Amino acid sequence: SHSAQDFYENYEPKEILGRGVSSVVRRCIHKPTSQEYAVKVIDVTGGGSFSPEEVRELREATLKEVDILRKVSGHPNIIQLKDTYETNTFFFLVFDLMKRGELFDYLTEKVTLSEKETRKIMRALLEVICTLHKLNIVHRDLKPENILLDDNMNIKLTDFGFSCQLEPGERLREVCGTPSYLAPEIIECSMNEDHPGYGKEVDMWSTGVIMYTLLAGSPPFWHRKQMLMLRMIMSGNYQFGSPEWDDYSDTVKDLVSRFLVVQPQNRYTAEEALAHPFFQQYLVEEVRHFSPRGKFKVIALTVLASVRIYYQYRRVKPVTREIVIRDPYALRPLRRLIDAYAFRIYGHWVKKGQQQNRAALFENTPKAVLLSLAEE
Amino acid sequence: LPRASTSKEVDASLLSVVSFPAFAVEDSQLVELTKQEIITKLQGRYGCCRFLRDGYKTPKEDPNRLYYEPAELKLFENIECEWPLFWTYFILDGVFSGNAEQVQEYKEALEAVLIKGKNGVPLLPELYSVPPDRVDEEYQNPHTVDRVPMGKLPHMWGQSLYILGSLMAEGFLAPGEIDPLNRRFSTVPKPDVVVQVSILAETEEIKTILKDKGIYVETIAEVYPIRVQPARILSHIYSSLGCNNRMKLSGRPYRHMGVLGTSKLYDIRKTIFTFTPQFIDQQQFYLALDNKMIVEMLRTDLSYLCSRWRMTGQPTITFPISHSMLDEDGTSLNSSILAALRKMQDGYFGGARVQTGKLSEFLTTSCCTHLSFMDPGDFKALVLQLKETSSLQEQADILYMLYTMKGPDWNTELYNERSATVRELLTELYGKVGEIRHWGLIRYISGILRKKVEALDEACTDLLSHQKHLTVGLPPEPREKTISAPLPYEALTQLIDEASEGDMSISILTQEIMVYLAMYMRTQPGLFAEMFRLRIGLIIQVMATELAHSLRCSAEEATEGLMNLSPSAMKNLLHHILSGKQGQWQRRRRLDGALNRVPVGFYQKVWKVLQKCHGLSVEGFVLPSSTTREMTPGEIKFSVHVESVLNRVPQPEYRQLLVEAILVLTMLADIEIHSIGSIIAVEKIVHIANDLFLQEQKTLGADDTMLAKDPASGICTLLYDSAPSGRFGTMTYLSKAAATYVQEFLPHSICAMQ
Amino acid sequence: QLTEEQIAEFKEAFSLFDKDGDGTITTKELGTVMRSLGQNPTEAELQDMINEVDADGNGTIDFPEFLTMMARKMKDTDSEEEIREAFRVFDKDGNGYISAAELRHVMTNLGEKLTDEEVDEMIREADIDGDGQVNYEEFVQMMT
């Protein structure tokens, strides 16, 4: 909380990089070394339209945020707070410059992602979540919009505005965040005050939801009405589309089902998730010993794979323009091109909020008289 | 900078601007970009070309004739002759700053193309012409056939430039002697500047109010040596520079001032003068009555001064606080004004450092200009009804009627002692109108007085400079206009008045929306993508429709609500609809068709498809495929023709579905490798897709009510409500219909592979 | 769910596929392994299978891709087809039966170094009825 003169004579602002609800991010340089950085200027007065209780609570919130982010600093995959400057009207928070935007624009441009980058991002997120849980700190705000990408595909968590310390033996009873990412425990806290509380399970549910939306391309739960969406979430009857996931492995789908569990106790932890065979890999080892049955099994598996590879290659179908006449959605290239073209035509009506979402573009429902039955 | 003009992709004459003569360029990255572009596009064998497709001195064209016929399909391609002048520019450009190896390379290259005449002295030929017989080979092998000298060649320009370059390279002269003004250091960055702002109080009450909240200011008095006046008197003063009676010279004509000129102090007859900025003038327009915009233009103007400030000394801004800046009860300033004051306190406001104080301290450190050229060498019944009646509405109606009928300048004789003219009463009504904050007749009276916004031509030329076409007026043709070139202020005002006709308020609304776009594109020039042509009238009707839908009222009520909104409301709604943020899908399709937001690479795909077909017929009108060879996708005329062909249909939903169908044709054409050799009817494809959708829905078992028919379409509304993608989207139906139509005109074999 | 023993078996199999330890199947090693059994498809066929297996055009196969491929449940009919082809690979001699000599020849062809005592012991342990022979039901039940 040094004087503003130090910031004025040490950092020189530059052009705007982005805008927010009440803050804008600008580029700055460090005069001694000419190192680029990003500074977040927060107007605690809110342009003078804030009653002083609002100013006081915003100042308390930002002080809590800075002193909770002070401890976490050190992890390579987390945002680094380089300098802090405080005035009676403005806060200057200096972080690392990333380069590009966060996950929303990337996913919108690429429509859907493959498993190769998915494995890496999920591994990094699980490591970060495990480290955060080890430090007895919770976040409750995993959204794709709070994860930034570097030029080398590096992710680090940011926007900890809702993070708070959790004393052991305590059970929080507060409700916050986007309803689509709300775990059933939080909503149960909403209706009923007798429920004890929640914990890291909401974090696992959020991880499952973001994994689902990056894989399928649409959120697992979404509807035009909030009440029906909440009932949809409470029911916990997420379904798999038929002509959408016919080219994905069984292990990934099993992991999908394992992440999303209604019972809080049965939900998998970060350590348990990291031990799944999906992340299994080998470098080198020479202590493989077993019975002759093991040798026969391994040789049979090798022969079976060698035989099956050719048959799997042979299972390709031609273009079948007649099938295109009947149904073009069956073919994967036709589906991907139709999807990408629909996205580029209608690409500037996908933004923040429940009013507009990616799920509003796809219509897998058979639009007919069955739309009459909606709810009670 | 990257393009010479809106018609030429590049002109090699841009080198002179960015070389030895008249250095005017910043952000050197653009300099290297344009140098690399000109090198990779205009370099030849024995010279460089002025620009693509110039026919000067060619074995075709019938040089005896001028006024080129529009038949430059291939008669002026890859046969632009040469121009070594741009080559001899390169040697000087290289040798000037720090480059030597490039100088040697260019000298070696140019020495080979030299010709020796009498006495064995260097001579620079003008250009080398392609032989008239070896023309077909060049079309297949560009820059391969040798050329021959032809034309005038005592070219003194290039010869003198080369002589100066050689003399410079020999080292007899230094680069610092050619330009004593040191114009070589235009690329040196400047860190920043500090802005000084002084605050003054108009009266004692305002001073007391500011002192109550802890702000120490000083009134207009007590600074008797220093006087403050508006900027229009300063313009009238500057309108006398360089005036001569014997030679019939009238001096500098009247013009508006920027804030860059009023900031600096002035000296007039051993006296100090300070001039307030021009945007606090309430006698010109009413946008200065809103505190939010006052704050916004303060922010943008402080940013503008802090950006360049290419003058010596710190700036100085005077911001007097006016009576209109108080609240309703007149005992305290508005919250926004107090917030702005606290904000430029502590030395950070907007995007600049602001330091406050008193004019006494700023006097010793501030730029001062010494000025020397100002040194001495029954209508009576109607009038009675107006006098007796009340209400601002009838007031405006009767004043307008009297002005239009008999009172452009006639005295009303309302007051027996003072001659009260209609104009005097109208301008007096402003005082009463401003207090009530009623945006219901202020625009009405402003239309009667025909007030004009300053710097409108600047906004128009800024709009035009972005490769943009303007259009004033509601549809349809021919009253709709097209401003493709900048026009004078009087011509612009006459044109907008003619377009707006007698609706009067339309001219004011057009001016306001133009000004809104004007300050908007500079800050965020990113939302104007996906757009090629804007119409003020279409935007106005879209605004009225959106407000009517929001309020669920009639058109008249929507217009009344729109005309009553504060200007901040118009800015907010314009930004909202520019961002883009049954009944849901159909509304958005209608908005898109109204704003005809065609994709970024639409014209390129249309051109590629036209390359492999005879044309695209749209309800009789046909676009022949011969257009593809007389024109290139980069230029404007193809976009104009494509939009005109697509704009024949009036219904926005039709144009959007046509865009979707032609785009699905574009994607489907890539898979097959064949030539259709026939004309394609997009409407037939749309009807086939609609029929397939209806048949599928009937097969499912839907009742007849949902398969409704629009009164004048033949297209189900559920198709409009349907999303594009998905297993039940309109894209699948359009693709199926397009494939069926392609098969209908195909020799019994598709042979599609990808 | 998967178990540690099956992880070890899969890792050993993948190491057996890659003759030279590099971390990738590679087109050349796939080709030589495939020619070892007696199949000679063309070079373009090899790249086409590589592209089909891989999620992109990198032209390489890693451990996760093989783990995904081997963990697939092939239903029923494809399973009998695959096991029939594998049997025919092991049943080069027109007898319908697997002997110690045939398995020895197969393992020598695949590039394994063992002794006759090893093949005798493993064929004895695998066998049930004690005739020195493995039938269709025994083969299909031991697959895992």
mmCIF file of N, CA and C in Angstrom, chain B residues 600-654:
data_model
loop_
_atom_site.group_PDB
_atom_site.id
_atom_site.type_symbol
_atom_site.label_atom_id
_atom_site.label_comp_id
_atom_site.label_asym_id
_atom_site.label_seq_id
_atom_site.Cartn_x
_atom_site.Cartn_y
_atom_site.Cartn_z
ATOM 1 N N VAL B 600 -17.349 -12.789 -43.170
ATOM 2 C CA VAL B 600 -16.103 -12.131 -43.561
ATOM 3 C C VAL B 600 -15.585 -12.579 -44.918
ATOM 4 N N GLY B 601 -15.642 -13.874 -45.223
ATOM 5 C CA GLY B 601 -15.130 -14.375 -46.484
ATOM 6 C C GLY B 601 -16.228 -14.755 -47.454
ATOM 7 N N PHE B 602 -17.328 -14.002 -47.415
ATOM 8 C CA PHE B 602 -18.490 -14.318 -48.239
ATOM 9 C C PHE B 602 -18.213 -14.087 -49.722
ATOM 10 N N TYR B 603 -17.662 -12.920 -50.063
ATOM 11 C CA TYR B 603 -17.460 -12.571 -51.466
ATOM 12 C C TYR B 603 -16.447 -13.493 -52.130
ATOM 13 N N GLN B 604 -15.410 -13.902 -51.396
ATOM 14 C CA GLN B 604 -14.426 -14.822 -51.958
ATOM 15 C C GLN B 604 -15.062 -16.161 -52.316
ATOM 16 N N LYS B 605 -15.895 -16.703 -51.424
ATOM 17 C CA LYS B 605 -16.574 -17.962 -51.721
ATOM 18 C C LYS B 605 -17.532 -17.806 -52.895
ATOM 19 N N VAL B 606 -18.238 -16.673 -52.959
ATOM 20 C CA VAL B 606 -19.136 -16.429 -54.085
ATOM 21 C C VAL B 606 -18.353 -16.405 -55.393
ATOM 22 N N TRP B 607 -17.192 -15.746 -55.393
ATOM 23 C CA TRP B 607 -16.353 -15.696 -56.588
ATOM 24 C C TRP B 607 -15.856 -17.084 -56.978
ATOM 25 N N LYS B 608 -15.424 -17.877 -55.993
ATOM 26 C CA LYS B 608 -14.937 -19.222 -56.291
ATOM 27 C C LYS B 608 -16.038 -20.090 -56.886
ATOM 28 N N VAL B 609 -17.263 -19.965 -56.372
ATOM 29 C CA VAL B 609 -18.374 -20.742 -56.922
ATOM 30 C C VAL B 609 -18.721 -20.258 -58.326
ATOM 31 N N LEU B 610 -18.729 -18.937 -58.530
ATOM 32 C CA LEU B 610 -19.012 -18.395 -59.854
ATOM 33 C C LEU B 610 -17.965 -18.827 -60.870
ATOM 34 N N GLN B 611 -16.745 -19.113 -60.411
ATOM 35 C CA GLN B 611 -15.710 -19.637 -61.293
ATOM 36 C C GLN B 611 -16.092 -20.969 -61.932
ATOM 37 N N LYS B 612 -16.958 -21.762 -61.293
ATOM 38 C CA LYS B 612 -17.289 -23.100 -61.772
ATOM 39 C C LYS B 612 -18.774 -23.241 -62.094
ATOM 40 N N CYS B 613 -19.415 -22.163 -62.536
ATOM 41 C CA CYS B 613 -20.816 -22.223 -62.935
ATOM 42 C C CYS B 613 -21.096 -21.075 -63.894
ATOM 43 N N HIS B 614 -22.231 -21.173 -64.589
ATOM 44 C CA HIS B 614 -22.631 -20.147 -65.542
ATOM 45 C C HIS B 614 -23.274 -18.932 -64.885
ATOM 46 N N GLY B 615 -23.709 -19.041 -63.638
ATOM 47 C CA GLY B 615 -24.295 -17.908 -62.953
ATOM 48 C C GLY B 615 -25.237 -18.363 -61.855
ATOM 49 N N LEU B 616 -25.756 -17.374 -61.127
ATOM 50 C CA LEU B 616 -26.685 -17.607 -60.019
ATOM 51 C C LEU B 616 -27.922 -16.748 -60.259
ATOM 52 N N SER B 617 -28.997 -17.374 -60.729
ATOM 53 C CA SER B 617 -30.247 -16.664 -60.960
ATOM 54 C C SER B 617 -31.032 -16.526 -59.662
ATOM 55 N N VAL B 618 -31.576 -15.332 -59.434
ATOM 56 C CA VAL B 618 -32.394 -15.043 -58.255
ATOM 57 C C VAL B 618 -33.663 -14.361 -58.760
ATOM 58 N N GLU B 619 -34.714 -15.150 -58.982
ATOM 59 C CA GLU B 619 -36.029 -14.657 -59.393
ATOM 60 C C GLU B 619 -35.932 -13.777 -60.641
ATOM 61 N N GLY B 620 -35.484 -14.392 -61.732
ATOM 62 C CA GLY B 620 -35.379 -13.692 -62.997
ATOM 63 C C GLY B 620 -34.033 -13.032 -63.208
ATOM 64 N N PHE B 621 -33.638 -12.166 -62.276
ATOM 65 C CA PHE B 621 -32.339 -11.511 -62.367
ATOM 66 C C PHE B 621 -31.222 -12.542 -62.278
ATOM 67 N N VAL B 622 -30.230 -12.407 -63.154
ATOM 68 C CA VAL B 622 -29.141 -13.366 -63.266
ATOM 69 C C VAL B 622 -27.817 -12.633 -63.107
ATOM 70 N N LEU B 623 -26.852 -13.302 -62.483
ATOM 71 C CA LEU B 623 -25.502 -12.770 -62.367
ATOM 72 C C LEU B 623 -24.586 -13.571 -63.282
ATOM 73 N N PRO B 624 -24.262 -13.050 -64.465
ATOM 74 C CA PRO B 624 -23.474 -13.833 -65.425
ATOM 75 C C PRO B 624 -22.080 -14.138 -64.898
ATOM 76 N N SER B 625 -21.563 -15.304 -65.287
ATOM 77 C CA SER B 625 -20.228 -15.718 -64.877
ATOM 78 C C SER B 625 -19.124 -14.925 -65.561
ATOM 79 N N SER B 626 -19.445 -14.157 -66.606
ATOM 80 C CA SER B 626 -18.431 -13.347 -67.272
ATOM 81 C C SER B 626 -17.917 -12.223 -66.382
ATOM 82 N N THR B 627 -18.617 -11.924 -65.286
ATOM 83 C CA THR B 627 -18.172 -10.894 -64.355
ATOM 84 C C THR B 627 -16.872 -11.277 -63.652
ATOM 85 N N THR B 628 -16.563 -12.573 -63.562
ATOM 86 C CA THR B 628 -15.419 -13.008 -62.765
ATOM 87 C C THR B 628 -14.095 -12.643 -63.428
ATOM 88 N N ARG B 629 -14.084 -12.496 -64.754
ATOM 89 C CA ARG B 629 -12.837 -12.224 -65.459
ATOM 90 C C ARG B 629 -12.567 -10.738 -65.648
ATOM 91 N N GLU B 630 -13.596 -9.897 -65.610
ATOM 92 C CA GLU B 630 -13.423 -8.457 -65.727
ATOM 93 C C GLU B 630 -13.226 -7.779 -64.380
ATOM 94 N N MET B 631 -13.124 -8.544 -63.296
ATOM 95 C CA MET B 631 -13.147 -7.967 -61.963
ATOM 96 C C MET B 631 -12.450 -8.932 -61.005
ATOM 97 N N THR B 632 -11.945 -8.394 -59.897
ATOM 98 C CA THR B 632 -11.230 -9.159 -58.889
ATOM 99 C C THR B 632 -11.964 -9.073 -57.559
ATOM 100 N N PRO B 633 -11.863 -10.108 -56.718
ATOM 101 C CA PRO B 633 -12.585 -10.075 -55.433
ATOM 102 C C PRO B 633 -12.199 -8.912 -54.532
ATOM 103 N N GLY B 634 -10.954 -8.434 -54.608
ATOM 104 C CA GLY B 634 -10.496 -7.394 -53.702
ATOM 105 C C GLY B 634 -11.175 -6.052 -53.882
ATOM 106 N N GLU B 635 -11.577 -5.716 -55.106
ATOM 107 C CA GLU B 635 -12.154 -4.406 -55.369
ATOM 108 C C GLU B 635 -13.619 -4.364 -54.928
ATOM 109 N N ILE B 636 -14.202 -3.165 -55.002
ATOM 110 C CA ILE B 636 -15.513 -2.903 -54.411
ATOM 111 C C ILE B 636 -16.691 -3.273 -55.314
ATOM 112 N N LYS B 637 -16.526 -3.188 -56.638
ATOM 113 C CA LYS B 637 -17.669 -3.292 -57.541
ATOM 114 C C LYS B 637 -18.348 -4.655 -57.445
ATOM 115 N N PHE B 638 -17.571 -5.718 -57.227
ATOM 116 C CA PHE B 638 -18.159 -7.045 -57.069
ATOM 117 C C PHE B 638 -19.032 -7.111 -55.826
ATOM 118 N N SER B 639 -18.565 -6.531 -54.719
ATOM 119 C CA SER B 639 -19.389 -6.472 -53.517
ATOM 120 C C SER B 639 -20.663 -5.681 -53.770
ATOM 121 N N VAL B 640 -20.550 -4.552 -54.475
ATOM 122 C CA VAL B 640 -21.729 -3.738 -54.767
ATOM 123 C C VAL B 640 -22.734 -4.530 -55.594
ATOM 124 N N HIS B 641 -22.262 -5.202 -56.648
ATOM 125 C CA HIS B 641 -23.157 -5.974 -57.506
ATOM 126 C C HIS B 641 -23.780 -7.144 -56.756
ATOM 127 N N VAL B 642 -22.996 -7.828 -55.920
ATOM 128 C CA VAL B 642 -23.520 -8.968 -55.173
ATOM 129 C C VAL B 642 -24.597 -8.516 -54.195
ATOM 130 N N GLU B 643 -24.353 -7.412 -53.483
ATOM 131 C CA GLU B 643 -25.367 -6.898 -52.569
ATOM 132 C C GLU B 643 -26.611 -6.444 -53.321
ATOM 133 N N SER B 644 -26.433 -5.797 -54.478
ATOM 134 C CA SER B 644 -27.585 -5.363 -55.263
ATOM 135 C C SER B 644 -28.412 -6.551 -55.738
ATOM 136 N N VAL B 645 -27.747 -7.619 -56.184
ATOM 137 C CA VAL B 645 -28.460 -8.818 -56.610
ATOM 138 C C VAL B 645 -29.183 -9.457 -55.430
ATOM 139 N N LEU B 646 -28.533 -9.501 -54.267
ATOM 140 C CA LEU B 646 -29.144 -10.095 -53.085
ATOM 141 C C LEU B 646 -30.190 -9.196 -52.440
ATOM 142 N N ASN B 647 -30.215 -7.907 -52.778
ATOM 143 C CA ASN B 647 -31.145 -6.965 -52.170
ATOM 144 C C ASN B 647 -32.418 -6.765 -52.982
ATOM 145 N N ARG B 648 -32.602 -7.512 -54.074
ATOM 146 C CA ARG B 648 -33.850 -7.415 -54.826
ATOM 147 C C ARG B 648 -35.038 -7.821 -53.964
ATOM 148 N N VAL B 649 -34.878 -8.872 -53.171
ATOM 149 C CA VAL B 649 -35.963 -9.325 -52.294
ATOM 150 C C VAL B 649 -36.059 -8.397 -51.088
ATOM 151 N N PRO B 650 -37.265 -7.996 -50.665
ATOM 152 C CA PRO B 650 -37.373 -7.065 -49.532
ATOM 153 C C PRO B 650 -37.374 -7.739 -48.167
ATOM 154 N N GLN B 651 -37.812 -8.987 -48.099
ATOM 155 C CA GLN B 651 -37.957 -9.662 -46.809
ATOM 156 C C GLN B 651 -36.602 -10.069 -46.242
ATOM 157 N N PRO B 652 -36.250 -9.628 -45.031
ATOM 158 C CA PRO B 652 -34.946 -9.998 -44.451
ATOM 159 C C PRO B 652 -34.756 -11.494 -44.259
ATOM 160 N N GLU B 653 -35.809 -12.212 -43.861
ATOM 161 C CA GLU B 653 -35.693 -13.655 -43.689
ATOM 162 C C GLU B 653 -35.334 -14.328 -45.005
ATOM 163 N N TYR B 654 -35.900 -13.836 -46.110
ATOM 164 C CA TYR B 654 -35.548 -14.373 -47.419
ATOM 165 C C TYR B 654 -34.072 -14.179 -47.721
#
